[PDB]
Design a protein around this ligand. Structure first.
Ligand SMILES: Nc1ncnc2c1ncn2[C@@H]1O[C@H](COP(=O)(O)OP(=O)(O)OP(=O)(O)O)[C@@H](O)[C@H]1O
Ligand SMILES: [Mg+2]
Lengths: 187, 210
């Protein structure tokens, strides 16, 4: 039943990502209006720059964990669909690859690996032959709603900000600064 | 009048106004003595006078109140504070005080305190409910102080490179290692004026010894 857990994890990740996005937008717009304003508090400008950078780091991390959750839920859904599909029509699939599946129990490691590789090549050629004709399909009937509500792929706004990678020291110092921000804003 | 305006004035107009009101041959004595005589005459006239300053307590509660402008000189103008109000208001050394001041009577030569209207720029009852400095938890310098004024001053360079060499933050421990004839005094006053310009909110104090 981990599909529902993955779904709600993706939902709350999206909610947190939207919260980070809107708070970053508010911070940047107030920083811009203070820049255009008559105020000249340089300390305020520096602290606003610090807020902007820490919020950008938080948004990047939220996008990264959202991408991880989305790929995890997609993998779980694919695994479940393939599992029930093979439980439905797996005997015919095994018969279609019989010339390299007989007596798999006593085969050695290299023989088992080579047989698996040959089976993967066979199914890959079948899949490319199927995709050559371009026969359009839809989502799985049992879990169509989850796939539709999570989307085929995450939007660009969740990857365009996630294309920058931080060094581990940068991650640690940003985490410390975020903890300091939380401690100072709680009071 | 009040001690605040009296202290921060050159002795010229002070002695002229003292002569115009008329005290004595008020030329050959200390400035503190002149202020003391003027305050005594004004108190004898009958007008109430405010007072303000910084309070200190001796080992026996014999409290004094000095002024920052006079470099905390132990002159006669310092306000006497008895232990009674010290215990009543639960104040200690370093608490800025301001309020009515009692003129001295026979038996003492120091101005006393009638009542205090505020303590350390706060109400006397509100400032009592405060913890000591050592009871706080130290933290790193989160905020950043920038010496760049932004006006492109030709002499601002000494400050600018400082931001490129040693960032300044609130609540940090700063030390300067300087040999004689290194221009450290001008650098320090430049830092002080840059702080006063960029950050007028923060209280600035500059201490000089010998
Ligand atoms: N940028 C500068 N341009 C011109 N003169 C400078 C500059 N920086 C420093 N000086 C000179 O350096 C001299 C050093 O005198 P200053 O009083 O500033 O020294 P200090 O290092 O503060 O120490 P001390 O006063 O004890 O000698 C000044 O008299 C000043 O003429
Ligand atoms: Mg000097």
């Amino acid at each position: 039943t981990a599909l529902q857990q993955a779904f709600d994890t993706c939902q709350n990740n999206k909610a947190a990502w939207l919260q980070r996005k809107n708070e970053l937008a508010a911070a940047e717009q107030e920083y811009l209006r203070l820049l255009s304003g008559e105020g000249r508090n340089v300390s305020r400008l520096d602290e606003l720059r610090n807020i902007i950078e820490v919020r950008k780091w938080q948004v990047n991390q939220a996008a990264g964990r959202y991408i991880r959750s989305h790929e995890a839920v997609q993998h779980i859904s694919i695994r479940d669909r393939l599992n029930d599909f093979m439980q439905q029509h797996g005997t015919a699939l095994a018969a279609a690859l019989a010339p390299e599946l007989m007596g798999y129990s006593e085969l050695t490691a290299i023989a088992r690996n080579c047989a698996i590789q040959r089976a993967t090549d066979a199914l890959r050629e079948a899949l490319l032959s199927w995709l050559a004709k371009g026969e359009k399909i839809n989502y799985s009937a049992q879990d169509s709603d989850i796939l539709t509500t999570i989307g085929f792929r995450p939007d660009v706004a969740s990857v365009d900000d996630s294309r920058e990678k931080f060094t581990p020291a940068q991650n640690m110092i940003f985490s410390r600064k975020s903890a300091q921000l939380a401690s100072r804003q709680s009071v | 009048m009040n001690l605040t305006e009296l202290k921060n004035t050159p002795v010229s107009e002070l002695i002229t106004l003292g002569e115009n009101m008329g005290l004595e041959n008020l030329a050959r004595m200390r400035k503190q003595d002149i202020i003391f005589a003027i305050l005594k005459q004004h108190a004898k006239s009958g007008e109430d006078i405010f007072g303000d300053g910084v309070l200190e307590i001796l080992q026996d509660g014999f409290g004094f109140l000095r002024s920052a402008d006079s470099s905390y000189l132990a002159g006669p103008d310092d306000i006497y504070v008895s232990p009674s109000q010290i215990r009543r208001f639960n104040l200690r050394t370093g608490d800025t005080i301001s309020g009515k001041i009692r003129p001295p009577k026979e038996g003492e030569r120091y101005f006393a305190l009638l009542k205090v209207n505020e303590v350390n720029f706060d109400k006397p009852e509100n400032a009592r409910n405060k913890i000591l400095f050592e009871n706080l938890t130290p933290l790193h310098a989160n905020s950043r102080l920038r010496m760049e004024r932004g006006n492109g001053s030709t002499e601002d360079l000494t400050a600018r490179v400082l931001d490129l060499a040693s960032p300044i933050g609130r609540g940090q421990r700063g030390l300067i290692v300087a040999p004689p004839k290194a221009g450290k005094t001008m650098l320090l006053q430049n830092i002080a004026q840059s702080i006063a310009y960029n950050h007028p909110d923060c209280v600035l104090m500059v201490l000089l010894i010998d």
